[model samples]
Target: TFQPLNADDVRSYLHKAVDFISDYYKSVESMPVLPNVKPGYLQDELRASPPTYSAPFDVTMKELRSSVVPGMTHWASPNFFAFFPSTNSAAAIAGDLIASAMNTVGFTWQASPAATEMEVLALDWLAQMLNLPTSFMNRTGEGRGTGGGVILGTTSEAMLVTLVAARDAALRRSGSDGVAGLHRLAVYAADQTHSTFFKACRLAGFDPANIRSIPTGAETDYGLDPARLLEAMQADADAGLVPTYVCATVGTTSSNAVDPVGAVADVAARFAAWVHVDAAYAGSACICPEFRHHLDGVERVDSISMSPHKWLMTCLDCTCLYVRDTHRLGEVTDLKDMQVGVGRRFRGLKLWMVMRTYGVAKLQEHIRSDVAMAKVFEDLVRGDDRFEVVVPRNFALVCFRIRAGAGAAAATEEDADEANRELMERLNKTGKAYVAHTVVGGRFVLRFAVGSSLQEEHHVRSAWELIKKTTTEMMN
Candidate 1:
């Protein structure tokens, strides 16, 4: 006779899974930040052919540990600081559980009123936390009207969507055919802006040359200059080119350089161009009062995008895109037409849970702690004469490199680049810590980002020790 499964069985499995996950979190502090596995290592160990029959759940779970987990990079590890943090807390995991169980498609309010309302409310909560102007909140009651927000898969998608919206709006005003007139359209950003803006321009049918990346001065801390932006727009206009949009970055990827939002807004207004702020990494920290100053004059922006996955302690694939004009996004993108999937997942549930569990004060504390930890790391780097910081430390990211020899510094940019490249490789190979590298001003430098949910002072100090030890051994 076949046996039926009961609620007790389901509860038992869930409880066991939760316990395993908790243990995983507990072990993160001790794990290496980066995996030491070689390319295709797992593939070499596992069979290539598909399984012909079903296996027992126990057997599958055993394989998950023996085969899968070992191959994965431990992003949750306290020592992980190579990339932006993809951190998730117990609250977020619990939220994911409820969201999966409910299985509600949140594309429309009619489909899931609670999910939709919660998302709207959560956006307002985040806006207030960031100290965004009343005009930027959905129900801030400002005369200029309220901005709106939505959750997207990533900042790249958000940038592309907003670029398309701006393109459509510009084309509508110009009374021209879509692709035919898109050639003359141009977008502007600082040299420090993320590559996503240029990618969006390409995807939107704009010529690569049409997307101008204006050079920023070191004096401005690598931030975009409004004067240079205005000059570029005026030159583009004179050349019969249409300036359609400007992307201002709050926390640049390589060095975490912050653009002058108010200044950029002034230039955008002059050119009647759409201004979108890409605040993917540092936006989460803005929830704290100390960091909110970074967003001054954010109300003037047409749209903004951020990643809760980066520093907000959310799981991967959670990017929140907000716009001053919701109608423009809805009208241009027309989500119903562009979306490939039949139903949407309840993403907002996780954000809502994180908000409620930590509240604003605790969330601020988390951000502050990360920033403070980064500052500590910066101090350590500064104290050492062997390393030199390439860019001003901003947010939780520090870009620096070994001050090798006068030959390395004075050598061709290519030689300096190769030296730094090898330095990063050796450090990651040590398996004690992992840090990524970026080319700033044509010279390569190491990038250390500190925002992992499990990271603490000890982890940061350990990473620093590993870096110093590796450099010392390499020089000898």
Candidate 2:
């Protein structure tokens, strides 16, 4: 029996879910970071028939833990160091719960005023926290700005929309002769930048051939060399191609390589190109003074983005996109044209909740502590002759590798690569810890990204111990 006015069922399940989440966090350190089950493993565990009968939440939860959870990678685990932080917290989850219950469509101001206004306020608050220029914020009555911020689902969509915006603006600026003008457009990014830029180009209807992957080497410590970028831009322009857009990254995907945005911005200015900085992972660390230089030239960038989910302990469906110039933003009257879609989740709520709940001081401590954890690992790697750091660590990411046979004089680069590959497989497959790899320069480098919301010094130490043990066994 159900009563329309009663919400006991809702309240009951909410507490139950809280317990479920608590248990999940408690078991993370002991459990495998990723599901070890083979493909189709759940096929037999789950019943084929959907129960037509009404049952309590536990009956459903039992099925979830048995069938669904096993097949999932526990990204929230402190042991998860593979990519970057995919974090969640009670504060963020609480806001998300309310947002989910409200189920508001927040595409525009007039449509959903509270949700829209909240996003503007939240974004500006975040911008101020990061010391971002006021020009990027939308600050009107309640909320609305000359230039503004949007809470997109992810960094990819933010890149996609910006790519489209840059392309259209470039066309009009160049006084294009038609579709052929579009073909002349070229975009530039460091070789170390995330692959999202490449996809943003292809999917946004720009030519891949024109996407210049500027070479970055250890000489510049893996950061983008602005000199190389300018040369490439000139070559493209000399070829009768219009330099349209360029990108710089604060924290690159493979390694924590930071492109010198100040230098990059100097170059982007010459081409009159739209500059976008994708600070998906390391951007959160900028609140620390040591990382402030990364934001130095970022102010002049046309737009920028950061993922709260990645480092701010927020649930998914929240990304902050800051645009400095809104002159061309008026070109797209349609919601779909501005962003990648007309429907956006109420992402502002969770972000606002998390930012307010944690405050700047706490967030700074979280970030600083993560970086300290990374430094701890880096120091250990440096102290040991058995391992070597592949590149400079700019933030909370450490890229290192097993040296060519600590014992074998005949060990080669290929041997080291093979051993490190096996070591990564062993670490992840053993269900103790999870890590990822990237080929830096010409060597296979392991990436230990320490940004989990619950991670501490112990988790980092434990991972190192596992690596050292596994490596010894492999060498033996």
Candidate 3:
């Protein structure tokens, strides 16, 4: 009989792992938000290849802490202001605990009825929390089981799936199988839209030249102009190009720029285009009634998606893609066709647990707190004359540019960019706070996204203090 690691070592190791995670979270602020490590550092310690012998649990744990932990970027740290935080909580973790133990590969209802049912129920609950239109419900017409939602790995996958669906649907409407009329097909998204949009188009097999990057300007806060979008579509139509899809972004990655969904939808309708509202980050904020105004024209779209993992206290890897017309899901293709992979993870359970545990009210409070801290960060940046708000503060991200000095705002573009880059590099090296940047209004800008679960007003203040100190050092 073989001695199994799952016998006693598994239980003991997992118990210790829980304690390790707790300790890490408690001390995250003390660690570097950006890892101060070089390439191939881990290979120097760990084996170049797999060890021939089975390692003991303690040995594995020790190596993990020493080799892996030191090389990691602590995104969970309250001081982290990078890209976006995948907020985590005990309730969501507990749900994932059960899911991992079960290790389910749920694809069909027969394979796991409970998994499918939970997936359906959880997204419906989330739809209500977001105050989505009735046309998107599991049972849109009283007892009809048609239009609904599905949990995917990320917004990229969600966009990819819908892109494929839209492509297929469009080809069928054009009375062709596929590939025949692809040259005449085109997709549209704002210049500020996530790169994932282009990735989705590429993976969907759209011609590289066919995808339109509709340029946006600072006058509209980098938002996609509806009139410009309409003009593009009209020109495309005139050229005999059939519009297939239009991705209206709610919170663009760089600045959280919001597009006009209703106006965009109106233009989309003329071309019979499939409208998708990609609200991967800011959609969670719209759970609060006040912020719902950002989604004013949402209900008119064909499909929409939001990531609970982005801001909601749910762990990483959970994006809900809901469709207004679910019957069309399998008219030509099924969920298996909707995704690139066949086996899907049991991610729905975690979202379900998080929703039930926190409820709408608690979730709303969390959103409000995030927005409140972001507002504080915005005010702190604005209070400093040396710093200018490059783009209007929207949602939880503040895109700002640091002037070289009090006179730096009037400095040359190259000089301002050089200083901003230096400041950003200095901030990251400090290991206290980590922030990323983007180009706003032709100026290099810093993006301070406030989404960490462990974040608070104190954390924001600390980050601001670090930014100020770094600027002072750089100016000298």
Candidate 4:
């Protein structure tokens, strides 16, 4: 008896929605990258519950333009340099439109054969671009190995699923069952590793105490040292604990520190621990010949995950995960057995569209362009005597901060930290530019991540000028 909203004029409404999105993208750079709103700001502007009567679609659209937009942070804006960017493209949006219209729940090949097959094909194309080992592809030059790829929503889920599989494999090797063997299993990662790794470990029913946070230092550029990793695994093995999994990061969140993937794999091999590479942001860079070295020795790893949403001009929520052996994760053409969730969205369609539209050449250029901009920013920071690059720029993220001796009031480390914190707040409040912060080597630093797809040379230069002006004002 019920009817959908504007069912008769759905095509007209779709056009209207498309126009709205297009306009938003066109004007996003002029808006605040970070919203000025505080907590509970939205509650004051909107109704507490749904209205008793249906409202016109026009009114709903009006509220979206007014209320919803004002409360949002424009992550797609060229001015947005906060965290890592969530990139979007016209091709990706079109793909998303078709995918949403179909609403295919790709739980199995029988449920949606195109969805499953497209995912396999798309990930294999991506695997080739990144020069991933043949074992990670569904169809390699020689033939298919037991390995293959899957699309997850985020790296967090990727980490969780692979961790669970590794844990199960470890338990099987030891001839133990479930939680009984969990206590005897140990996982390792650098202290700079994303917090999600630990979260995934906990969710996989791992012992909290058995998780190792190997300390990293500036000597290794905050990367996980292979020697230190060896010591940690050896210690755990000697203590009657099974070395289970090691997460080697290609681009760590804090400073974009790239862990030595092959070295970590070598250490993991001693005890049969699974090696997983978390290359969420930097993996996109590997498509370029120059940055491909970052992923050197990837062939020996067990699994890898990268988020196209982060930097590859794909819309939100597309993480490509590859494994050396699909059987380890309950191998199947059903696809449902590979992930934590049985119901899956058509994420691969958008990824495929992005790759197809941009092609490998343009994709490589995009990565190079962003890295060049980051280098420009790094050079700017270096040119200013007041600032210090906390760690060398790796990929598109530059870790830098105002030096302690540069400011008159910032004579000590704590003072410099507070000064840098104040500078970031003041700069963000101006609504001209937005940047995020992190701590590297016990010192607070700013993370200027050049990732917005709309970003250009002028945007980076303008952001730098703003940063300089903000720092001077704060010092005064």
Candidate 5:
């Protein structure tokens, strides 16, 4: 039957098509977690021009598999644990679909009251889930001002916005335009902090040379050294430099290194610097009481960002950026002062649905599951004599390397770095499993981040097995 679908027709079709989604998830484990096809193979298969007329539904579905599926990285597969997870659960996807249908813009309360209120409420719900400080909650018993949260596009954007706000605030206090104050506006982060900090400073109109990286060592567990930060800031100030902001990381992208928030905050306070904590990867784990210790002294931070898209089962673009003083962000971004297209998408719908569906307890359980799986992988690595743990397991990431064979000096830092780099390159080319490499303390190491939604104990063990087998083949 020929049909032009209306809203009702679309709803009916979606109900029937839900079975396909269910089947996909059920059988997803059997599929290759990573794509095997060479690049541009799918483009070569498809026609060069768009069709002139409407296509049959069957033809569309067929093309989805033959043309689209082969090109996908199979991120939903259980064994897909390379970078940080960008997960989307069934409920979250359903919410996104509904949001698409509604297509509401909720930049201000007057534009779409329901959407704006929902965004605020969802952020408050997240704050409670993470047991954040009273200063970060809208209404806590501590009577801290009307603190609230906002959903940003990503952690990178959040950091940039916060840095700009902090910069402006510092300039205002100094009674100088940001440009005149730029020479003194220094930002502090560890050597292991994400490269985004430098990018954020550049985007926020701060001098690139003004950003300082505190030295960290193995004794500090790859974390930022507060003493080092203090000394650096004091020396810079002695040279007439203005140390104004500190960006501490809770779970760094590479190696998952966590800086000491309390110590960093103390140092920043001494310098009157604004403190921002970047918890893009491990923040979801804060839902669990046991994991909350990692975020100790978070109350001291002026702002914090977490990506539900990373570890929580939410889709991309679902990152939440919370500030102790919400007005600071609005003031700096001039979001309220905008004249055109001030409205924004109703992006919080998926986050609200995911939060309500899973609840804090269930979400914490998922995080714990991933952490447990990572520990299992760590034990396996420790058991293998040829493999060595480089940074041990922190949160859900394990950084390690394959030991060089006889006559290959593992003692030399240069040789160890080369051996690990080669091992990682070989692993990726094999297409069995995908992992990333990073240089920590001037030594190369492979980073295995276990935060994918579909990952389980078996997937972790299977990845380890693949790594060991691959290393043996490479060595021989």
Candidate 6:
């Protein structure tokens, strides 16, 4: 009975579960965005070991409410403004639910043909929405091209896959053995680059000393400079090292800095290095005409990656990676050739459902609305004399911190940094709203990223009020 396959029992449980989730969503805003629990707090309330016998679904749901729900940070809460948004929707969840029921693994076209084809089609549709170059489209108006995309589980996987491909290609071109060439291969990225980029390079066997993390400063708004990139490559070349690849980011995680992809591509061309644009967070906004310029010169890059789950109304775990030439990914019938994993989930079904449920127009509206809400928070921070916007507002992330005032609490630059850090900690401890912190240009800054599908103008306003109230209390 515990694992019954009966349709009647399933139907009754499914109905009840649907209602439970709907009710949870309706009341999620009233819940704290962060959990109040400390280290191992759940241990006191939960069993020490698993039960030998299976409990009924009703009992399972009850335990979830009492133990699991309260322990969660409530990422779906309307007031969630931490990190990048991991959004969800009814359409995406419905699609994923069906995908789970089907339980298909798309390692190759022959192994679940529909799953593979659906992934290709979904990626092409998204590419068109973002106005990506014809070189990135699998289904162009004329016909199929060497360009195509695949739906990986996350950006980190995409990075590792692309990096290994580029590494292998470089070794082949040099006519050198694999391990011998990997030592001399140098990878490039801005210091503002996501930490995963470095992690991927290490996983791909690049020398840590050769991983060029070119530093950025306040003048360039922390963006990667092409001249600096060129300098780094030239030095590496003179040292008998080969420049393998360059990662240009449309939106850096720390400050949302937009690297000059075209310029970076131009510099990389002289070295015959592969260029990849990591636009995991802001690429979804490129569907809007006004924000499309952020992806300017992306066409020249060898590959690009974006996460639909970040801003697009898709459930977690869907990253779209497009390559200029499929041949570079090792020509093969199996989709496994293009990625690190042998088995891939039917992630495209959720993306397909999201794009279909809300067409291009509605998706653009969703992005624009988030940007507008961010502007609202920006205005509030600027209007207050005691605060300073740490960086230029880019996309929906606003980086701000309390200004260094003459008071002892924030008298010097160092004091101001501590004050901001303390403010963030105290506010997070309050659990009224959730925000994250990042250090940019040696100053502690708070990052308020407004990308939740359930977020509204009032939520932004209220969070701003809470920040002000917390700051005032801390200062006095």
Candidate 1, clashing residue pairs?
none
- Model 2 Cα lDDT, one tens digit per residue, 69-141: 8788888788899888787778899999999888998766666878877877788888877788766766644
TM-score of 4: 0.97
lDDT of 6 by residue, 375-432 (tens): 9999999999889998998899999998898256999989898988888888777777
Candidate 5 off by > 4 Å: 1-5, 12-20, 37-39, 140-145, 327-342, 405-419, 429-431
- Per-residue lDDT over 51-160 for candidate 5, one digit per residue giving the tens place of the 0 to 100 score: 99987555766687577766777677776667787867877898888887788877667677777767767877889888887678664544444466777777888888
The TM-scores of all predictions, comma-separated, are: 0.91, 0.94, 0.96, 0.97, 0.90, 0.97
Clashes of each: 0, 1, 0, 0, 1, 0
TM-score of 1: 0.91
Model 6 TM-score? 0.97
Those runs of model 4 whose alpha carbons end farther than 4 Å from true positions after fitting are 1-7, 141-143, 328-335
lDDT of 1 by residue, 48-156 (tens): 9989986655676677778887777788777777868886788888887888877898666777778777776667778777777665556553433356677777888
**Candidate 6: count of backbone clashes, pairs at least 3 residues apart or interchain:** 0
Error of 3 at 270 (Å): 0.4
Candidate 5 accuracy as lDDT? 0.77
Q: Candidate 4: what lDDT?
A: 0.88
lDDT of all the models against the reference?
0.78, 0.83, 0.85, 0.88, 0.77, 0.88
Candidate 2 yields a Cα-based lDDT of 0.83
Which pairs clash (backbone N, Cα, C closer than 3 Å) in model 3?
none
Which residue pairs in candidate 2 have backbone atoms (N, alpha carbon, C) closer than 3 angstroms, thus clashing?
138-145
